Write a protein that binds this DNA or RNA. Structure first.
Ligand SMILES: [Mg+2]
Ligand SMILES: [Zn+2]
Lengths: 55, 143, 49, 137, 100, 344
RNA sequence: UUGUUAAAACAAAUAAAAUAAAGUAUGAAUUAAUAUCAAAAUUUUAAUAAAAAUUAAAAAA
RNA sequence: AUAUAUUUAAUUUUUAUAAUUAAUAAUAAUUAAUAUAAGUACGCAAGGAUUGAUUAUUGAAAAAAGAAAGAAGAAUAUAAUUUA
């Protein structure tokens, strides 16, 4: 009973929210005021400065 | 056809565990215990588990016409101080009849008094062995 | 008719960059949980209330 | 979209428009400088006797916009001390308790000596609703 | 907490639970002076932005707070590892004179 | 109730003197047609009927002469004005509480009740709302658990700003009758409820996540079957229907808990109006901190809750006297216990 | 729970608690006539008819 | 004793706020026995009434608007129990 699926049935998955939020989504980032690197808020660096104070 | 089991309603999903701090809940528990004490449904007690464990107790259950009296040995005390929780584990034997009761304090139709805060762990062990032997004999006769 | 729409196309030649605007200062549900969260073991010399 | 669903989806704005048109007649009065609330005729025919010869009472209640505004603005008076102190009764006492004992008859087993003011078992069982004249409990 | 207690039963329990009795002794020697002036939350966890490659799992750096006030470790740099993993850790130039 | 056809509303079935409208003044006779041609050939236009006149006159005389004997017949005129509490029309808004804890109490007969204590931190009438101004379509929103401004979301802090009421954590709406209003910002004291009162509560039970079909329905989940197909009771012919699809409502595994659960008609046990606590002898399923909503039970066993035999409510809402100070008043003094009741 | 022995032990078997068995990367094979495939009910035509007709309206992941 | 389609059970993550509209009569045919109803009509006697309330299951029924890559815990049930 299984059969080959037309290209339209292969593109139905991208209409759901599960596909959009998993693969194609951007990040909210800024520059680490102590490392000058892109950093997400919540995750810090190994350096002594970034551990004592959270940049 | 279709129904929904979960509700993301704000009024239902919001919680107050952060604001529970402004409620003196332990003070409310102590106030309820003190009200029970002043009414006479219970009497304050301050003993430890090993001290009370193994002390004889007499409990009278008020009942018209004749209140039923029962003398047993305290097997376990659930609380060391007085509270609305309470809990005592007594073991009493009649003529060829053993029984293990869990007396809660504060019942007006139930007056239980331990004859002495001091207890004898030897008598406690004797009562425990008697109860375990009776229970094992009952189970063996059943199965 | 639709023959006019068929013969005449409409296009966006070069849309501006899709770079997201600064959204750190807006409301964010994932960062909302950390506003009242105890973070004592997160700092050593610079504890702030 | 079912038949009833489509019918209601297309008629509900029309129902609201009809209600707006109805209230436009009321607003006609306040427009002329004479603001007058709607008047309803009080019906005195609401106590009936049915086919089976028992009492029926219709309930008609009206709403006063001025009283609504007054309750919105002014705070209610102080609650009564006895009202908030005396607790509400748990069990509903029967309409006619059967005492089964009266001290007036010399011989209590004498069925003819019991006073008439004591209700009977038939009333004790059947009287579960108020009497014909009195409507409320 | 066990080190602040400093009881013989507490030391026996820690020696039971730990692999190295030498580390047991090191802890019981250094931690009282280190955390005399603290109540709770002695350790400190910092979530690193870099994740492990094989599992894409987040990493956390857990270290004791009072490093430079009183401890055998003092004035050491943890921003980068030493030249070799068997060499002593980096030391800040400010406190190079201290000895272990 | 007793069936009463509208066609049985003639004057021969009315218990009181039937009064015809007759324009502005009520009359005892049908409106005679102003146009004489409209008179039907057999319609007997009555202007004066001695029977009805004598009956109505004697009725009015007796009503005006013996008020004590005919007190119950006074409801035929001068009805109760609008605004006063009514036994069958006046419903009041409830409150929003927080499930505080659980304990156990005992009544004087000896029955043990495992009770739960709810806490009502700050009940304040926040809003009024009616949709397009229809009948019975008005409700009162009550807010609870005052919070700072940095707590709520911006779009809800904006509403609290627009309302002017102090910003509350939660807000629940109760549908009421217009004569039970309370001005915006009214503090609701817990004594709004009575100890011998039946209450309906609504909350959210705890969440268990995805659970098996056995754990969801207990023993019921193992056997689920329903056949609406026709089957031959007697071997006379052959005919039946095949149950092609699965009927909706089939009991399977899925989300368990985390739903809006409502208990109907639980009696209050005790009330503490110093710490704003209410005790209910029913163990709930929700967690600690779930914002429950309490409302008044309409009626039980065909009997209204608020009546003269049981008691009168604090309509519209309980307001404490001026000289009362809950700070000076002790905790043990603020205890109201319900009358005893046995359930076995 | 059952069965065996003796005046508690052994063997079976399931239904509650507990333990594990990834949300990471690597990645086949059965199958494949097909319209972005016809949610359902009624009636009917040469055997399940998913073939036809009549009501009805069946969202997406 | 093979991973399929229709159909079902759920979910799409704080939405301040239920449902005047799909559940087209009813969650029991608006019940309903029961001590007390009654050592009582009816029956020579023996025996034996209609009956509806408190004891019970009787509220019958669907909570669809806000900025989303940590554990929705900074985790030993405290929104930081003092903290260098
Ligand atoms: Mg959301
Ligand atoms: Zn950095």
């Amino acid at each position: 009973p299984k059969r080959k699926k037309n290209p339209m049935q292969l593109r139905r998955k991208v209409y759901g929210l599960h596909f959009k939020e998993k693969y194609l989504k951007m990040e909210e980032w800024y520059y680490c005021p102590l490392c000058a690197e892109p950093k997400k808020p919540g995750e810090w660096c190994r350096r002594e400065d970034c551990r004592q104070i959270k940049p | 056809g279709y129904t929904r089991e979960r509700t993301n309603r704000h009024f239902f999903v919001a919680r107050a565990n952060a604001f529970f701090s402004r409620l003196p809940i332990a003070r409310v528990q102590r106030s309820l215990a003190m009200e029970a004490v002043r009414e006479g449904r219970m009497r304050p007690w301050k003993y430890t588990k090993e001290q009370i464990l193994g002390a004889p107790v007499t409990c009278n259950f008020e009942y018209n016409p004749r209140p039923v009296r029962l003398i047993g040995t305290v097997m376990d005390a659930h609380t060391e101080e007085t509270s609305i929780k309470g809990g005592l584990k007594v073991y009493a034997r009649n003529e060829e009849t053993n029984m293990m009761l869990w007396i809660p304090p504060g019942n007006p139709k139930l007056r239980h008094e331990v004859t002495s805060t001091k207890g004898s762990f030897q008598h406690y062990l004797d009562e425990r062995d008697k109860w375990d032997e009776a229970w094992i004999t009952g189970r063996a006769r059943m199965k | 008719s639709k023959e006019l729409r068929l013969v005449t196309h409409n296009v966006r030649l070069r849309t501006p960059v899709r770079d997201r605007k600064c959204t750190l200062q807006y409301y964010n549900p994932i960062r909302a949980r950390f506003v009242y969260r105890r973070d004592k073991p997160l700092f050593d010399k610079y504890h702030v209330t | 979209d079912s038949f009833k669903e489509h019918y209601h989806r297309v008629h509900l704005p029309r129902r609201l428009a009809l209600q707006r048109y109805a209230r436009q007649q009321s607003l006609r009065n306040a427009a002329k400088g004479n603001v007058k609330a709607e008047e309803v005729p009080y019906k005195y025919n609401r106590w009936w006797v049915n086919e089976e010869h028992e009492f029926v009472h219709q309930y008609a209640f009206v709403e006063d916009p001025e009283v609504t505004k007054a309750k919105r603005e002014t705070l209610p008076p102080v609650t009564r001390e006895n009202i908030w102190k005396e607790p509400q009764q748990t069990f509903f006492l029967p309409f006619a308790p059967y005492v089964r004992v009266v001290d007036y008859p010399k011989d209590p087993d004498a069925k003819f000596l019991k006073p008439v003011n004591i209700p009977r078992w038939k009333d004790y069982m059947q009287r579960t609703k108020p009497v014909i004249p009195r409507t409320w409990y | 907490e066990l080190a602040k207690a400093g009881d013989t039963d507490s030391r026996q329990q820690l020696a039971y639970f730990l692999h190295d009795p030498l580390m047991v002794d090191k802890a019981f020697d250094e931690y009282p002076r280190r955390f005399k002036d603290m109540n709770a939350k002695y350790a400190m966890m910092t979530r690193l932005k870099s994740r492990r490659r094989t599992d894409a799992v987040a990493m956390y750096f857990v270290e004791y707070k009072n490093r430079d006030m009183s401890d055998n470790h003092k004035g050491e740099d943890y921003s980068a590892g030493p030249e070799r993993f068997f060499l002593p850790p980096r030391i800040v130039e400010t406190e190079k004179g201290i000895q272990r | 109730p007793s069936l009463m056809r509208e066609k049985d509303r003639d004057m021969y079935h009315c218990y009181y003197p039937y009064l015809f409208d007759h324009g502005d003044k009520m009359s005892l006779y049908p409106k005679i047609p102003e146009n004489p041609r409209e008179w039907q050939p057999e319609q007997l236009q009555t202007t004066y009927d001695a029977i009805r006149e004598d009956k109505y006159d004697a009725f009015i005389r007796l009503r005006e002469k013996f008020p004590e004997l005919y007190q119950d017949t006074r409801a035929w005129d001068n009805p109760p004005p609008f605004g006063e509490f009514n036994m069958f029309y006046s419903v009041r808004f409830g409150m929003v509480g927080v499930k505080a804890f659980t304990c156990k109490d005992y009544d004087e007969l000896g029955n043990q009740f495992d009770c739960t204590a709810f806490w009502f931190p700050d009940n304040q009438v926040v809003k009024h709302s009616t949709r397009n101004g229809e009948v019975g379509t008005d409700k009162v929103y009550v807010g609870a658990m005052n919070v700072p401004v940095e707590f709520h979301k911006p779009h809800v802090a904006a509403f609290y700003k627009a309302a002017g009421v102090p910003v509350k954590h939660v807000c629940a709406g109760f549908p009421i009758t217009p004569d039970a209003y309370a001005p915006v910002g009214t503090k609701l004291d817990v004594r709004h409820f009575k100890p011998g009162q039946e209450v309906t509560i609504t909350f959210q039970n705890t969440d268990y996540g995805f659970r098996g079909v056995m754990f969801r329905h207990g023993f019921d989940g193992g056997y689920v079957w329903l056949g609406d197909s026709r089957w031959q009771r007697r071997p006379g012919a052959m005919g039946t229907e095949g149950q092609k699809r699965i009927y909706p409502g089939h009991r399977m595994a899925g989300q368990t808990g985390a739903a809006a659960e409502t208990y109907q008609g639980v009696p209050v046990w005790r009330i503490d109006y110093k710490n704003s606590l209410i005790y209910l002898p029913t163990l709930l399923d929700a967690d600690v901190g779930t914002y429950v909503r309490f409302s008044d039970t309409i009626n039980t066993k065909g009997l209204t809750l608020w009546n003269e035999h049981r008691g009168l409510p604090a309509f519209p809402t309980f307001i404490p006297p001026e000289d009362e100070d809950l700070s000076k008043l002790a905790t043990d003094e603020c205890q109201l216990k319900s009358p005893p009741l046995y359930m076995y």
